[PDB]
Write an enzyme that holds these catalytic residues in place. Structure first.
Site, mmCIF file in Angstrom:
data_model
loop_
_atom_site.group_PDB
_atom_site.id
_atom_site.type_symbol
_atom_site.label_atom_id
_atom_site.label_comp_id
_atom_site.label_asym_id
_atom_site.label_seq_id
_atom_site.Cartn_x
_atom_site.Cartn_y
_atom_site.Cartn_z
ATOM 1 N N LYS A 109 0.854 -1.186 0.000
ATOM 2 C CA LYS A 109 0.000 0.000 0.000
ATOM 3 C C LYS A 109 0.903 1.254 0.000
ATOM 4 O O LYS A 109 1.998 1.260 0.577
ATOM 5 C CB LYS A 109 -0.913 -0.031 1.238
ATOM 6 C CG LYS A 109 -2.003 1.034 1.306
ATOM 7 C CD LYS A 109 -2.804 0.868 2.618
ATOM 8 C CE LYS A 109 -4.017 1.769 2.707
ATOM 9 N NZ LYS A 109 -4.901 1.355 3.821
ATOM 10 N N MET A 158 -6.765 8.292 2.228
ATOM 11 C CA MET A 158 -7.076 6.983 2.808
ATOM 12 C C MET A 158 -8.375 6.922 3.618
ATOM 13 O O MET A 158 -8.606 5.941 4.333
ATOM 14 C CB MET A 158 -5.890 6.454 3.639
ATOM 15 C CG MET A 158 -4.647 6.198 2.785
ATOM 16 S SD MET A 158 -3.316 5.303 3.594
ATOM 17 C CE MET A 158 -2.965 6.360 4.998
ATOM 18 N N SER A 184 -9.322 1.436 2.366
ATOM 19 C CA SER A 184 -8.342 2.180 1.591
ATOM 20 C C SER A 184 -7.249 1.334 0.970
ATOM 21 O O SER A 184 -6.566 1.821 0.087
ATOM 22 C CB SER A 184 -7.709 3.278 2.449
ATOM 23 O OG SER A 184 -7.067 2.728 3.569
ATOM 24 N N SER A 185 -7.079 0.084 1.393
ATOM 25 C CA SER A 185 -6.052 -0.778 0.794
ATOM 26 C C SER A 185 -6.562 -1.436 -0.508
ATOM 27 O O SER A 185 -6.393 -2.643 -0.718
ATOM 28 C CB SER A 185 -5.592 -1.864 1.782
ATOM 29 O OG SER A 185 -5.333 -1.349 3.073
ATOM 30 N N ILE A 205 -7.873 1.216 9.950
ATOM 31 C CA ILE A 205 -8.313 1.986 11.118
ATOM 32 C C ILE A 205 -9.852 1.945 11.271
ATOM 33 O O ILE A 205 -10.397 2.309 12.312
ATOM 34 C CB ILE A 205 -7.796 3.463 11.054
ATOM 35 C CG1 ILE A 205 -7.907 4.147 12.441
ATOM 36 C CG2 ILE A 205 -8.529 4.242 9.982
ATOM 37 C CD1 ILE A 205 -7.210 5.566 12.569
ATOM 38 N N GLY A 206 -10.545 1.508 10.232
ATOM 39 C CA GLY A 206 -11.998 1.384 10.266
ATOM 40 C C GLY A 206 -12.517 0.246 9.404
ATOM 41 O O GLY A 206 -13.705 0.197 9.098
ATOM 42 N N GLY A 207 -11.633 -0.675 9.019
ATOM 43 C CA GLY A 207 -11.984 -1.742 8.076
ATOM 44 C C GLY A 207 -11.192 -1.829 6.778
ATOM 45 O O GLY A 207 -11.494 -2.685 5.948
ATOM 46 N N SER A 208 -10.158 -0.999 6.630
ATOM 47 C CA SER A 208 -9.469 -0.791 5.339
ATOM 48 C C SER A 208 -8.556 -1.913 4.802
ATOM 49 O O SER A 208 -8.003 -1.772 3.697
ATOM 50 C CB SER A 208 -8.671 0.515 5.384
ATOM 51 O OG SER A 208 -9.554 1.628 5.388
#
Ligand SMILES: *C(=O)N1CCC(Cc2cccc(Oc3ccc(C(F)(F)F)cn3)c2)CC1
Ligand SMILES: [Cl-]
Length: 541
Positions: A109, A158, A184-185, A205-208
């Site tokens: 990433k 991101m 984001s990944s 940080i939230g599911g990325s």
């Protein structure tokens, strides 16, 4: 705006020159090796690949340039590669021979700093600012013999679970060009999901890690926050510690994730960043085959699952039951609070102001939706809009009210509330005596430019960032014609704009992969992987 158009123009030059350079390297290798069975090499599972590199029956050159050729090929339809890590061809010749990932090409990433390369995060102000050094995890990959070779695309800043930015543009889902690859990944999702990389690293940080892994039909793991080193990771905001950033692996199978974590949890990591507790990978926990007490839920009562999500969870539950595991209904208490007060408040304790400075003088990519516009609203207006909307749309109201700036005094109070909630769920967990927890995972892939507005759909993953429990996702099924027809009757629990957008966004998804999510307690990555391995073995043969 002209400084930002210049940033984009320069970033596209660089991307193109990188792809051109990859092509010329690839062509040079094929010319010298016209009889290599490249498809047989590409379809080897990573463990067999590592075995073959380690015994000497496949050379690193052959593995590297075959994969490099596949990455370039699949990038044509996905736009997942932002940069070729040029010096990887000389790292390939120096790869430590006894390393547990000797000769394994690995994708990164874009936020994983690499010497001489931008980590733009799609933002104009980070363009032409090359990293002075590799980050710690990349150092550790190289010391274990891996060959990091590309940076993969991310959404701007991101902070979207889509994957577009004004510098490198929009990444696409390899299964269907109209669909998001997640984020984001997302670049990792697309690359690994199309066969162009056997292993990559993402952040979450939230599911990325979990969104892109689930949308692109691959496995990923978000460890406990401080199990791996974040030293050298590029970010939008620093010093926010209430909701932790975590980093982990993405791959085609669970065994690859275990191998990767095992290679990272070594003395090199622990001496390069002494702030990471030196917890070695406990193989015996990972390899255990004893029956598990598995908590489960069909729904979090926040985001109505798609028919496909529901079927995935129920079929997994039943197959685990047939194998001798005990399935125990279990839903963590007070999810709404954890999402709306704790998560939102932790991520945006300053009203989003530090986050917003990154966008000064920049375009706002459409995949972010109205996030920037909303965060920019004055505190008093967030509060008034919140009160107006509360009787109509309580979810939107809660979101608005908990993203306002606050004092250090209130941040202490929030941080304590986060601690206490964590002890609450742990206590709940230990009272039903769970080993692990099985949940739905958001799917199938949402239409492009819709995650930016399906904001509530983060509920399934965000919960475990707030709790900082290790969580991973495994593909278990594909959407059927029946699953997709049944979306017509999806209503959502609230009927607000977040439900309406998600409904339309999940249609026309026949054949797309769908996942479940596997959770363990903090520091129990080996058990989470053990569970994931079990789900994988029973659902995907
Ligand atoms: C990957 O890790 N990420 C981080 C999270 C974003 C998605 C996102 C965008 C904007 C805000 C939030 O936070 C948030 C908290 C709570 C709620 C709820 F209450 F559930 F509605 C919604 N959003 C997350 C994607 C990329
Ligand atoms: Cl710690």
């Amino acid at each position: 705006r002209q400084k930002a158009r210049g940033a984009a123009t320069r970033a596209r030059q660089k991307q193109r020159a990188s792809l051109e350079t990859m092509d010329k390297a690839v062509q040079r290798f094929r010319l010298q090796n016209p009889d290599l069975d490249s498809e047989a090499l590409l379809t080897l599972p990573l463990l067999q690949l590592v075995q073959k590199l380690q015994s000497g029956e496949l050379s690193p050159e052959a593995v590297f340039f075959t994969y490099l050729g596949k990455a370039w090929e699949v990038n044509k339809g996905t736009n997942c590669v932002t940069s070729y890590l040029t010096d990887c061809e000389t790292q390939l010749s120096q790869a430590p021979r006894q390393g547990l990932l000797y000769g394994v090409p690995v994708s990164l990433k874009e936020c994983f700093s690499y010497k001489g390369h931008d980590s733009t995060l799609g933002l104009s102000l980070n363009e032409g600012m090359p990293s002075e050094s590799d980050c710690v995890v990349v150092q550790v990959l190289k010391l274990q013999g891996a060959v990091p070779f590309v940076h993969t695309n991310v959404p701007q800043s991101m902070f979207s679970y889509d994957c577009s930015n004004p510098l490198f543009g929009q990444t696409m889902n390899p299964w269907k060009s109209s669909k998001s690859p997640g984020g984001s990944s997302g670049g990792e999702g697309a690359l690994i999901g199309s066969g162009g990389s056997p292993l990559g690293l993402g952040t979450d940080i939230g599911g990325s890690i979990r969104f892109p892994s689930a949308f692109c039909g691959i496995c990923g793991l978000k460890p406990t926050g401080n199990r791996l080193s974040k030293s050298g990771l590029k970010g939008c905001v620093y010093g926010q510690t209430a909701v932790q950033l975590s980093l982990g692996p993405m791959a085609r199978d669970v065994e690859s994730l275990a191998l990767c974590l095992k290679a990272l949890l070594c003395e090199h990591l622990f001496t390069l960043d002494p702030t990471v507790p030196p917890l070695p990978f406990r193989e015996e926990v990972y390899r255990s085959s004893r029956p598990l007490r598995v908590g489960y839920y069909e729904t979090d009562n926040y985001t109505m699952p798609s028919p496909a999500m529901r079927r995935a969870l129920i079929e997994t539950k039943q197959r685990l039951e047939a194998a001798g595991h005990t399935l125990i209904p279990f839903l963590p208490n007070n999810i709404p609070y954890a999402l709306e007060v704790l998560s939102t408040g932790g991520l945006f304790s300053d009203g989003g102001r530090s986050f917003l400075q990154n966008f000064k003088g920049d375009f706002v990519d459409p995949c972010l939706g109205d996030l920037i516009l909303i965060l920019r609203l004055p505190s008093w207006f967030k509060r008034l809009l919140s009160l107006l909307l509360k009787p109509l749309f309580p979810r939107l109201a809660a979101f608005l009210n908990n993203m306002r700036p606050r004092s250090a005094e209130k941040l202490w109070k929030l941080q304590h509330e986060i601690e206490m909630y964590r002890q609450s769920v742990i206590a709940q967990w230990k009272a039903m005596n769970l080993d692990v927890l099985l949940t739905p995972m958001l799917g199938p892939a949402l239409d492009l430019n819709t995650p930016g507005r399906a904001t509530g759909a983060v509920s399934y993953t965000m919960l475990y960032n707030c709790l900082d429990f290790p969580a991973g996702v495994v593909p278990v099924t594909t959407v059927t014609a029946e699953d997709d027809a049944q979306m017509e009757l999806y209503k959502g629990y609230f009927g607000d704009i977040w439900d309406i957008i998600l409904k339309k966004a999940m249609k026309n998804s026949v054949g797309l992969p769908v996942a479940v999510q596997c959770v363990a307690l903090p520091w129990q990555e080996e058990l989470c992987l053990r569970f994931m391995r079990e789900v994988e073995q029973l659902m995907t043969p």
